[PDB]
């Protein structure tokens with residue numbers, strides 16, 4: 082278990098993915114040329130998990146950039162770290178998906194898929210021991226959503242034994258204007274339930290609410306929302322890219338986090354909450370970081386953790402702090418909040434500490450929770466979907482692509498089953 | 513002459529192996545390059561044409577990380593490279609991956625290396641197997657290797673040093689599954705097994721050595737001291753010794769009841785200087801204190817079937833007998849009705865050696881008590897209950913099934929554990 | 944020991960029986976959830 086192959090699909094996928102690479106490059110002391118200029122051996126210890134070493138001192142992201150639309154790719158290349166990416170790894174179409182899952186999954190996406198698999202195969206065959214894949218995408222769009230899930234299915238066909246991980250951004254009325262987002266999301270959730278091993282449910286509803294309510298940003302931009310996404314992605318991947326005991330690889334993480342196959346949707350949390358540039362000169366002690374695990378205000382999925390129960394929790398503390406203090410504080414939270422943890426999964430809260438804090442913060446905490454409260458996010462999508470589907474609104478955009486009504490009915494039913502499954506284990510007892 | 517082959521499996525086994533072999537070298541005056549300026553040490557170290565002393569040991573891991581540290585470390589010259597065996601992909605805390613999927617690829621290579629060591633033996637006594645119960649390699653690979661060793665070695669003695677899992681230092685939610693699966697499969701292949709509860713060791717380091725947050729380095733140094741006490745009788749020729757067979761003859765009354773409880777004393781912090789020197793009476797009294805035990809359990813709630821006291825250093829038989837006589841006046845030490853002769857005593861001349869810069873103080877005399885008590889069943893019960901909690905809901909079972917294991921294997925393993933618990937209950941009943 | 948060797952070479956073959964057959968299903972799903980694609984690309988050029 083060593084290399085992770087990263088895939089970025091669609092507008093959102095490429096935007097968040099590009100920010101992930103500038104964030105982690107900075108943490109690993111890699112400049113936009115690929116040269117390591119840091120001053121800590123920890124930065125290079127597990128550099129091979131995300132970077133290939135090119136001739137000499139240079140490091141290149143093992144990242145494949147995909148879109149059916151060329152524009153986003155040009156914006157990435159033009160960017161701060163745009164020059165770091167492997168030229169041959171940009172695979173872009175000309176024809177666009179027009180925020181239509183059917184175009185991304187069946188039409189335009191299907192035409193480009195083979196050119197993408199050719200690049201993923203090149204990266205995969207170079208690997209000493211491929212752990213699996215990591216995909217960043219939105220569920221509300223057409224390329225990220227439709228093509229992204231098509232890629233998952235095609236990759237799964239060729240690499241059925243590798244771990245499939247995603248960072249899936251869920252749509253919200255608060256931040257986007259394609260009216261068809263509930264259809265694209267539901268059709269994608271149906272695919273993820275079946276095809277991924279772990280999915281980080283990144284909710285734009287929660288990110289907008291954090292920016293507006295907490296960060297007091299009157300009109301949030303995607304740049305503001307993406308600063309929270311990149312902070313979360315850096316946190317949840319800490320264990321994979323730095324030397325550590327717990328959840329050191331994708332398989333160990335999945336084995337410790339996923340009790341039932343379908344219940345692989347994680348609710349990420351982050352403390353402290355920061356705005357682009359907002360120092361972080363004096364803030365956050367160990368008891369303070371620990372308390373924000375149950376804080377709905379700190380959740381990257383618009384769910385209240387106190388409205389459900391945690392099946393499994395992984396908590397990653399970053400910065401210079403006491404391991405004794407972390408252990409005490411973590412135990413206190415489980416004892417005080419007994420009722421929000423399932424009794425039939427013993428020692429279900431696992432903690433890890435990494436000496437390297439993320440950029441701009443001296444202390445941080447990342448939470449990965451497998452909570453039954455995630456059903457609130459799926460319920461929201463189902464009710465938005467049904468409000469439209471009841472009236473068969475915008476169905477012409479999908480049927481016009483060759484899709485059938487049954488697929489819509491099936492995707493919805495599968496997602497409602499997922500909600501029902503979370504409710505079942507929420508109500509289950511250690512009798 | 514009377515050789516013993518040591519096999520170190522998985523992270524726990526390899527890391528404990530590092531501690532053991534470091535201690536043996538200090539005890540026999542062997543430098544980290546194998547050079548040395550009794551003669552019984554030859555049971556554990558072979559000799560080359562260059563006068564170098566090489567451990568009769570094999571280090572195995574399915575991931576290279578841990579062993580890579582041995583081959584870069586201080587004792588890189590002590591071992592020949594062929595006896596340090598590593599795979600690429602770990603067992604990802606999955607018994608099924610360790611036993612089947614991944615294990616099956618390296619098994620033949622590991623046995624070929626063991627065969628090469630056995631060919632250098634004129635009177636091979638058998639094997640000492642060090643592993644964790646919790647990790648996928650420690651659990652899965654060990655049971656696979658134990659089965660293969662019974663086939664290739666006929667009726668050759670096999671003793672285990674098993675790391676019983678603890679939540680303070682636990683890395684996986686699935687450790688109860690791995691523990692039960694390995695115990696069931698290995699039971700018919702092991703002659704005697706010494707369990708080491710990581711919580712007991714964690715608590716001794718905290719209580720006796722004043723270590724706020726004990727690390728594996730702290731735990732292993734203490735473990736190594738107990739292993740050295742058990743193996744001193746094989747590596748040295750004292751006034752009172754016990755070979756592979758005499759240990760088993762004295763402590764094992766029935767095939768399945770082969771789990772002695774170890775208790776060590778004294779454990780003194782390298783500070784103070786006034787907290788010594790402890791008499792033979794004082795160290796003997798300390799063996800009957802549950803705080804000095806290697807497994808957490810209550811002997812006062814169980815019955816003894818055998819008691820072996822292994823003394824080391826400045827100890828006289830008259831001192832020992834006086835100490836045992838006062839202990840016999842404390843009525844509280846109950847033996848089974850079918851056992852008369854309770855105390856078998858051994859004295860080995862060499863005082864306990866400590867690692868320079870270690871946490872342990874140098875003492876003139878120490879003692880290790882190996883007792884076969886029915887109270888050890890409490891450790892099985894704790895493990896079995898955690899297994900049952902998860903298994904009732906089939907939580908995480910899919911990870912094992914996916915690797916080709918069948919659900920029936922889980923039922924079988926648990927029923928065998930129920931029979932083992934029943935055996936300890938039946939053994940304690942009077943006629 | 945005679946009977947022992949076989950118990951193990953059975954274990955590793957009823958496992959390898961399964962491990963193979965759970966990637967039998969893995970692919971048959973993966974081929975059907977592709978057969979549908981043509982059956983749907985169908986309705987697109989068929990759209991009249």
Ligand SMILES: Nc1nc2c(ncn2[C@@H]2O[C@H](COP(=O)(O)OP(=O)(O)OP(=O)(O)O)[C@@H](O)[C@H]2O)c(=O)[nH]1
Pocket residue numbers: 521522523524525527528573574575602603604605606644645646647648649650651675676677678681682683687710728729731732735
């Ligand atoms: N005493 C002690 N216990 C250890 C050590 N390393 C791991 N453990 C314990 O063993 C269990 C974890 O299993 P590991 O040995 O780390 O894993 P592994 O055998 O390498 O297997 P995989 O990594 O899954 O392939 C937990 O209970 C740990 O607390 C060590 O050096 N000393």
Ligand SMILES: Nc1nc2c(ncn2[C@@H]2O[C@H](COP(=O)(O)OP(=O)(O)O)[C@@H](O)[C@H]2O)c(=O)[nH]1
Pocket residue numbers: 090091092093094096097178179180181218219220221222223224225226250251252253256257262285288303304306307310
């Ligand atoms: N957080 C975040 N969401 C985005 C971003 N760009 C688009 N989205 C969201 O993604 C969805 C639209 O999908 P998009 O990725 O633009 O389309 P695609 O190129 O066809 O996958 C909606 O839910 C948008 O709110 C971005 O940069 N950040």
Ligand SMILES: [Mg+2]
Pocket residue numbers: 522523575602647649
């Ligand atoms: Mg390991």
